[PDB]
Curated annotation (Swiss-Prot), chain B:
Outcome (variant: Q35H): In HEMB; mild
Name the UniProt record assigns to this protein: Coagulation factor IXa light chain
Effect of G7D: In HEMB; severe
Parent-protein start and end of this portion: 133 to 191 of 461
Disulfide bonds: C2-C13, C9-C23, C25-C38
Organism: Homo sapiens (Human)
Domain EGF-like: 1-39
Effect of C46W: In HEMB; severe
Amino acid sequence: VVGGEDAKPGQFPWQVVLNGKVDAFCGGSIVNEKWIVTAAHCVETGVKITVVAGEHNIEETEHTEQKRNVIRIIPHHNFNAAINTYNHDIALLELDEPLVLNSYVTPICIADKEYTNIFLKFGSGYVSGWGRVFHKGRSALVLQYLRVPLVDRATCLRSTKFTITNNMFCAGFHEGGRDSCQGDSGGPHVTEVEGTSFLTGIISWGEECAMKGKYGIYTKVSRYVNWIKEKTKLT
Amino acid sequence: TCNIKNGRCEQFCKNSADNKVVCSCTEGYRLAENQKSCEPAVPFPCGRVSVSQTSKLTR
Ligand SMILES: [Ca+2]
């Protein structure tokens, strides 16, 4: 996250970090005690992944961290149906052992299709993660967060040569300087509704980071909430 | 009706009969007594900060 601020411990208790062949390579959000939602591009069918909830500073021990192994990965069925489009960039991760919910490990709420869209349209959401804090620069040690405004579809479409599908939305500032970035993928874009946060998007892709005239592209969660609920039921 | 200020519902609203509304909440919450607000029904309901933050107030 470029141009953001340090989160306070427990401020985004749904946020998780994914570790694998590369450390702290993507983020995710807690759906329930056994499931994480992230971006499909982060989880290339094959390699082993670990999830850490209750994380704050990646180089220190807070004694709030809960590490779990991923035993099953479900990328959306239409991701990579086409090549290099980033469409349907969303995936679900099943944990080997249930997370233990507490003040530092709490799920993000997920509304139905209609309300998730209503919440996104409020027009202001938070993005967070441990990704780059500068275009082509170092990754964050302490979780970063940033409030970003929704960008109207035409300006969105008009800002890039790449196709922005109906499963995506743009968010960011006209002047640039503040944006999600590499390493932040899979993290949540969330909308606070009277003190309760709802998942409205997944950090997905962009061109460089925080450049003026460019915006972050996000997976539109409203289009996928039925799928998230069908796959993450606990027995 | 749900048209104005979400029917006064803290979370979800649905138009019912005779121009009136029925509020509901997401998982982990229950509709309060006033029929509009959402209160936690589990110890750690989704989407809320419970560390509360800081250590210097009346609390
Ligand atoms: Ca730590």
